Symmetry: C8
Subunit: 178 residues, 8 copies
């Protein structure tokens, strides 16, 4: 009767609202483009990229020789999901150590910001949740605040990086001999 | 009367909801691009690709000589079907053995992940359901976790592969002399 | 009155449903691309293509010399019809025999699959319903299962063919000297 | 009152149905592309194309010398009309005879099929309704069944033609010296 | 009240019907492309084109030398008007006579057909309503029936023309020395 | 109540009708392209273009040397206004006289037609309302009837002009030495 | 109840009307393209452009050498605002004086017209509201009436300018040695 | 009942209004393009860009040698947020001082205007909120009023800058030796 018609009309209104909300959520773009210059004097072998959030549509370049550039990119999961792209790239270095690069492009910018970090681990370590937590919570990550930051990585290596503050984040790092 | 009008309005609302759901289901893309480099010293002859899920729109390359690359791709079945693209590619090798490559790009990522595996079978074996089950459940498949994995295939052969974690999966494998 | 208004509303809903169904049925694509390599040592003269289902928009190439390739294609009938493209191509060979190639890309994949077959008939025979039934039900057709199949055709001829399992089917056959 | 509102709603529904039907009828394409190779040893002068159904948007080529090809095309009448393109092309030959080519691409394929015919008439005769009836009902036209058909035209002339079975019909004929 | 609401609904339905009808009427295309080859041995000077129906968007070429071609085109009046393009082109010839070419592409093909005519008038006469009536009703115009028609124009001149039967009419005439 | 709802529905219908009418009025195109060839033996200096109706989006070419062509164009005012493009172009000539060219492409073709005129005024006179009235009502303007018209301008000058009858009017004039 | 439903329907109608009105207001284009040729024998240094209405999206060219052309453009403020583009460009001249060019492309053409003016001020003066008022109300601006106007600027300088009457206004001025 | 239906209709109207408002807010563009020419005789090293409002999608160029140009751009935050792009770029100079450039393109132009400023700070200072407040409230910023402004920066340096008044702001500065 009248109640059923009102319920159906309300359901249709809720359906339209849900369609609009889902389209808006799916139209949100959170992508990261990582470019790392290798002036470290040693060849880099890709180990893995651990994605705490998001994913990548391309192959992680297996080898990055000295004087070359690692080019990589990722983005948030397809669909109306309120997650960004957060991850750690782990490359094996010729000296036997691991270069770890943390990137974080969050979905909700009301509570979170773009973050990035670079660190060198002794031995060959694959990027995982523990490495991400170390780089994000305990190793003093740099804010993606459209600023250049330099930090000595050790092992005769230093890093100079930059990351913008937008959702279309670009993380450019130069890892050079210290 | 009023009841019939309410029923028709509810049916129209359900029709609109069903149209939206079917369009969303059909817009989901699950495709796999397989690239296998042959540095095994022997020529590969295509046997078959068994698709547990999905299909392919191209011909499986009949011959892959040493130093060449097998390029292949597949995708999930057209239409609003909640299935991914899961399959095994079987190539005959010159020594008389079979190279089997398992790929798995699931539809529902809440329960499943991207998987891949590489194995060498003695004799000439065509890819089928049993081979897929062996490669997916009992031969320790590698997760498609944006990481490089290496494993000795035996018969003087080793494999080094990579697979991303997204629905637009790329599986790059190098099968080289051990 | 109220009954007439309800009937008209139901008719409009049925009209919208019918429009959506017809559009979906018409958007289904079932096409076949046939490529046959002639390494038989004899020239092929086109006889005819009998379409059990579907049709073709191009001319069947009249002559296919040795070392050349027959290129042909067909698709299902235009409009919202639940039929695929099923047919037999009959070519006359220089020795006086007929090369018959059966292709079958069904509309309903719930009950049917892609099928193909190659056979050589003594004498000059045009493709028709009987030839299609022979090739589809009694001459052991190969499944379009993304696999390479080889079969001796006789008369000093062998065939090696491939057909994928999708609705956008490609049938590649090489008919060579045995 | 209520009756008038119901009548107006029904009229609107009928208007929508009529619009959809007219759009579907107008979207139906029936076109014919005629290509006739002249290896008859004599020049052909265009006489006329009588369209039993449909029309053409181009000029009938006035002269077709020996070794050249007549290219022509036509289509069904613009608008939502349930008629195909049926006609006869009449060319004058140098010997004083007429080459008549019948083409028929019907609108309703439930009752009709593609047909074509080739004939040589003594003297100079223009294509008309009587010639079309002769070629379609009494001179054994060839079915447009994706098959090659050969027939001796007489006067030291033979014809070898092909016509597909689809609505986008192509009629390729070679009229050569017998 | 209810009557006013019914009247407004009927007015809206009539508005939608009128919009559809006007769009359909405006989408009807009736254009003519005239190409006249001058092999008369004398130069042609444009006098005027009298449009009984329709209009032209280009300049009538002032001079057409011997061995050149007059290219002209016209179309029906813009907007939803049920009129075709009917007119007479009058060119002055070097000998002091007038070449008049009548073209007629009607809007309603249920009652009318494409017509064309060619005539030579003594003296310099501009195309007007009387000339159009003479060429259309009393000088035996040729039907635009996809046929070639030849007629001696006199004054040592003959004409050979062709006109298709469609609304996108092309009228090709060759006026040569008799 | 019911009256207010009926009033609102009628207002919405009137709004839709008004939107359609305004869109149709704004889609009406009335533009004029003027091309004047100067074979008068004297240089022309632009004085002004007085637009009785419409406007122009380009600069009136300041100088038109002998043997060159003045290219100009205008159109009706943007928006749903029922006005055409009517104006007079006044150029100063080297001898000290003024060349005035009247063009008139009306909006309503039910009452008005395309008109054009060419005149030479003694002295330097700028185009204005009085000059337009003189050229349109008292100096015998030529109708834009797709016809070539010639008239001696005096001062050792003659003009030969052409103007089509459509709303996309082109006015081509040649002002040459008499 | 019924009153609330009527109020909501009226509010929706008003919303649709407001959306249409705002779209129409925002679709109105009022832009000015200024081109000033410098044949004054002195270099021009840009001082500023004071926009009484509208704005510009480009940089005012800092230097305009003798024999070069200043190219500039502006437009009305983005959004549905009923304002045109009115401003004064002030350039510093090498002699120590200021060249001021007033342009005015109004929004409402029912009350206003295109205006322009050129003046030379002693000393270096920046364009402001007072300069605009002087050039628009007291220094006899030229109407943008598709006419060429010349005026001696003084200081051994004269100006010859042109401005059309449309909303897509072009103001071309040549400032030359007197 | 009736109340619930009225509430649902009002909610739908509010939803449509909110969708329109959000689309309008998101369609507002506020971007800044900064171009700074370095004729200071010293190399510039990027320190950081502090965005009080908005963000940037590109990397701040690390080095700007003498005679080169810094190219940078930013825009307001994506989505329907009523914020502009306001920030300070801080570059390190070879002499040990900092070049700070303030840009401000506000969202609400009813209360705010485009502003810019250039200053040199002793020592190496990173752009932050305090620097922005200093440059915007206490160091006399130049208005983005389409005017060229010059100011001695000190330390043997002077600046000459320009900024337009539109939301698509361009800020061009030349920092040269004083
Ligand atoms: C009713 C149903 C409500 C369902 C709400 C689901 C919310 C999911 C948020 C993502 C998440 O459950 N968790 C996170 C994913 O967001 P992200 O990709 O931006 O990661 C955050 C960055 N960081 C480095 C991991 C900290 C995040 O916590 C979100 C929202 C906060 C709540
Ligand atoms: C009411 C009607 C409900 C109908 C539900 C149909 C669900 C079909 C799911 C696909 C499937 O029936 N089965 C599978 C196909 O999904 P897939 O292509 O991602 O394959 C899974 C990967 N794996 C390697 C085969 C394991 C899968 O099990 C789905 C969903 C889980 C339930
Ligand atoms: C109420 C009205 C219902 C009308 C249903 C019409 C169904 C027509 C199906 C096609 C068909 O009547 N018959 C067939 C055409 O499908 P196809 O093109 O895929 O051919 C099948 C393959 N094969 C090699 C010929 C076997 C087929 O049998 C369909 C459906 C099964 C029922
Ligand atoms: C209520 C109003 C119904 C009006 C129905 C009009 C149907 C017109 C069909 C075309 C036609 O009245 N007659 C024909 C035109 O179709 P065609 O162009 O395909 O020609 C047929 C082929 N042939 C060589 C001429 C035989 C044909 O007979 C159609 C339909 C059969 C009925
Ligand atoms: C209620 C209002 C009805 C208004 C109907 C107006 C019809 C106008 C038809 C055109 C016309 O009033 N008259 C004609 C224009 O059509 P045409 O351009 O095709 O010219 C016909 C060809 N001919 C060479 C001139 C004969 C023609 O008579 C139309 C229709 C016949 C009625
Ligand atoms: C209720 C409100 C009705 C408002 C009607 C306004 C009509 C304006 C017509 C243009 C005009 O008020 N006047 C004219 C502009 O049309 P035009 O641009 O085609 O100029 C006519 C040509 N001529 C050379 C100037 C004669 C013309 O008179 C229109 C219509 C006739 C009425
Ligand atoms: C109810 C709310 C109504 C709000 C109406 C606002 C009207 C704003 C008009 C612009 C304006 O408030 N004032 C002006 C801006 O228009 P313009 O850009 O064309 O400038 C006019 C040209 N001139 C050189 C400055 C004179 C002008 O006066 C408009 C309209 C007249 C009223
Ligand atoms: C009910 C909910 C209402 C919510 C209103 C939110 C308004 C946010 C305005 C932006 C802001 O909260 N604050 C500012 C951001 O705007 P902006 O990017 O143009 O910065 C202004 C320029 N300035 C150099 C920083 C001064 C500004 O104050 C806006 C509006 C004034 C109020
Ligand atoms: C009123 C009744 C029918 C309940 C309706 C619940 C709706 C509003 C809930 C149920 C499931 C929810 C979704 C569940 C998961 C996600 C993924 C997350 O990353 C973003 C939010 C999103 C997309 C939620 C949006 C809101 C949602 C659609
Ligand atoms: C309320 C009455 C009419 C029953 C309605 C049942 C509807 C909701 C059911 C019936 C058949 C169902 C479909 C059957 C098969 C598939 C393929 C699967 O891979 C994804 C889901 C999908 C696409 C289902 C979606 C839901 C579905 C359309
Ligand atoms: C219910 C009352 C108003 C009668 C409605 C009659 C309608 C359905 C009839 C009247 C005229 C008919 C049209 C008349 C002529 C043709 C051309 C033919 O080649 C195809 C069908 C077509 C296009 C008809 C379609 C149906 C039609 C539009
Ligand atoms: C019911 C009341 C409001 C009367 C409605 C009358 C309508 C249907 C009439 C009035 C004026 C008519 C138009 C007048 C002139 C022409 C130009 C002609 O070449 C084609 C028909 C066309 C386009 C008519 C179509 C039908 C028309 C719009
Ligand atoms: C019923 C009540 C609200 C009165 C409605 C009056 C409407 C129909 C009137 C009022 C103002 C009118 C417009 C006023 C001016 C012009 C410019 C003219 O060149 C073409 C007509 C046009 C565009 C008119 C169209 C009709 C119009 C919109
Ligand atoms: C009537 C009941 C449901 C309350 C509705 C409140 C609506 C109108 C309010 C709640 C939250 C508000 C938004 C909150 C934040 C922002 C960001 C700001 O930069 C622009 C305005 C904007 C986008 C607001 C627009 C209006 C808004 C959507």
């Amino acid at each position: 009767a009248d109640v059923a018609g009102a319920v159906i009309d309300g359901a249709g209104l809720g359906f339209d609202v849900l369609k609009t909300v889902l389209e808006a959520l799916g139209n949100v773009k959170r992508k990261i483009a990582v470019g790392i210059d290798n002036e470290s004097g040693k060849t880099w072998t890709a180990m893995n990229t651990y994605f705490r959030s998001g994913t990548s549509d391309i192959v992680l370049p297996h080898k990055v020789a000295h004087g070359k550039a690692l080019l990589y990119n990722g983005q948030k999961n397809r669909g109306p999901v309120a997650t960004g792209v957060v991850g750690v790239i782990a490359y094996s270095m010729s000296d036997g150590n691991t270069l770890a690069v943390l990137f974080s492009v969050p979905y909700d910018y009301n509570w979170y910001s773009n973050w990035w970090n670079v660190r060198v681990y002794k031995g060959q370590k694959r990027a995982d949740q523990r490495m991400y937590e170390e780089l994000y919570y305990h190793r003093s990550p740099f804010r993606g605040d459209n600023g250049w930051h330099s930090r000595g990585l050790g092992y005769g290596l230093k890093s100079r990086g930059f990351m913008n503050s937008s959702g279309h984040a670009i993380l450019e790092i130069h890892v050079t001999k210290a």
